[PDB]
Design a protein around this ligand. Sequence first.
Ligand SMILES: CC(C)C1=CC2=CC[C@@H]3[C@](C)(CCC[C@@]3(C)C(=O)N[C@@H](Cc3c[nH]c4ccccc34)C(=O)O)[C@H]2CC1
Length: 455
Amino acid sequence: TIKEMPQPKTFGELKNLPLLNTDKPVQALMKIADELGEIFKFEAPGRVTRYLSSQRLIKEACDESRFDKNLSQALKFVRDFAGDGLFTSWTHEKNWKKAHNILLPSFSQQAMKGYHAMMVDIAVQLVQKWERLNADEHIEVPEDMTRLTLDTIGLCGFNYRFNSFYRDQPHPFITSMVRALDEAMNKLQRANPDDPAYDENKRQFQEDIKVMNDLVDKIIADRKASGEQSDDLLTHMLNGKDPETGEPLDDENIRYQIITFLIAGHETTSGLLSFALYFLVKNPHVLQKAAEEAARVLVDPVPSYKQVKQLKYVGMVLNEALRLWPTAPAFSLYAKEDTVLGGEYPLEKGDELMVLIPQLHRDKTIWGDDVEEFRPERFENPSAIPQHAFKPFGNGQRACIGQQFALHEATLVLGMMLKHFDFEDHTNYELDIKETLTLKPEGFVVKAKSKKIPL
Ligand SMILES: CC(C)C1=CC2=CC[C@@H]3[C@](C)(CCC[C@@]3(C)C(=O)N[C@@H](Cc3c[nH]c4ccccc34)C(=O)O)[C@H]2CC1
């Protein structure tokens, strides 16, 4: 039985476009989904998309025989500097499958043993920073988690030290990367982008792209010249051959992969740690259980690879933070052919869907009535979760290549944080979620009291 799709309020000839004229568009779309339900049409001059929020429909959207990854306008704007790297390439572009085949073994769970020592290097810098704070001082949580995640991907990725724990001002590459990401996201709600009023934006955008290309191209050239085999992603990309084509990646594509990894490993990854610590300080019984596990498992001055794998409750804490506030909160699909979604919604070839991940993760038919409660134990029996209910890393062959890397990093540093410190929500922090490329708890601060356990 073919059904008419709900649609939020319109603004005459602008249709729904002004609803995304807001600094919190994901949260705005979540409130629309609360009102309209599992699917709604969103129209703007010259475009239509459909926002999905239910496991019932998203399980069908996740069928790779019917739907492929679409580049959202967000991704198309980011492609001006991430090029045909893995994140901003179409599945049908030669460089997508070549890079996928070359890089997948470098990102496997087994590959994490090789990155572990470098991850420990940066995690120990974070612990030392907090051990060295004076009594009257607090922690700026997203700021420090971003120092950790950026430095970890730079060191593990390219053997490059951003030295974020030695700085107040971002590294110049990061200044340019953040300003380019801001400009990409600002262009989403910029009417009349060719207005000469935006000439200075365009000049600054080009300058920022040049900064990024110059440093990354120089790192690649320097590595090729030295012949150093540093067993990092860059070594793996210079040496690796796609089994299918038999070709390696070219230097330009390697640059795009590095820029892509640095984007993803910045606030997108540090957001998970920031939300996890937010939920732990707001749920003291959960924090106590996580801290008990950290003390029981992390018996050595430095965590081992196997000990991080042992932090099962810490893993469930991270999955429960990804459930409520997934930090890459949407992805886009297109219909490969004419098809009917959920027996009710006919789609034509090319028709676009958006998956609103935070709303999927609040589907009471999956999670039950308590969907707003932070309860890591809901991940104790993962075989009981229906297909495609939990999608913080996207879908299928276009799922996050960084999933094992991100969860290993996050589990290691959260375990060390819980072993080494007691935490205080000293301001009774009121959650304020800032939306950029990603989501973060803006202004989240805590005090950490050392347990005085040596490293
Ligand atoms: C780069 C990666 C990490 C991101 C992916 C994203 C996907 C969906 C985005 C996003 C969350 C930013 C806010 C807009 C939103 C929700 C979106 O639906 N956007 C649609 C619809 C849209 C909004 N404004 C537009 C202007 C023109 C065309 C389309 C649009 C889109 O981008 O396509 C955004 C965050 C950044």
